[PDB]
Amino acid sequence: AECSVDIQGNDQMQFNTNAITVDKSCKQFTVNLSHPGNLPKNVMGHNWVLSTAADMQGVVTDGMASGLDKDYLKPDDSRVIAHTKLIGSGEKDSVTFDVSKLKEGEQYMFFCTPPGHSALQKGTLTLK
Ligand SMILES: [Cu+2]
């Protein structure tokens, strides 16, 4: 809604949106991640990670590398403009960030970093 979106990460390796919209007149933007289903974080955990489209794969491949105890993101990966933490079924985690970190004329991509998840769980974030 007002300066934030609710997104669902389920048991079928999905996000219920591939296009996140951000009103320019938002000083900050909040994302509230939610996980319906009964699979554990260690079997079907998701996160919400944001970067440019050029950096997405680096962030994914490195996040792949770091492991489960790093939530499948690289420590202080400066390619990450913001990210929620890894959540299992029934859990929730929200993230908030400076809307000014999204520079005009750039391509931004949200995605889930566990192994193979981004292939279905990825999308565009737009600073309309
Ligand atoms: Cu995922």
Domain boundaries, the chain: 1-128
What separation in Å is there between the alpha carbon of 25 and the centre of ligand 1?
Answer: 30
What separation in Å is there between the alpha carbon of 98 and the centre of ligand 1?
Answer: 24
Instruction: Kindly list the distances between the CA atom of residue 52 and the CA atoms of 17, 41, 45, 79, 89, in Å, as whole numbers in the listed order.
Output: 18, 26, 23, 8, 28
Query: What resolution in angstroms, rounded to 1 decimal?
Result: 2.3
What separation in Å is there between the alpha carbon of 121 and the centre of ligand 1?
Answer: 6
What separation in Å is there between the alpha carbon of 32 and the centre of ligand 1?
Answer: 15
* Structure obtained using: X-ray
Q: Which fold has domain 1-128?
A: Immunoglobulin-like (2.60.40)
The Cα–Cα gap between 35 and 46 comes to 8
* DSSP-based three-state secondary structure for 71: coil
CA triple 123-3-13, angle to 5 deg: 30
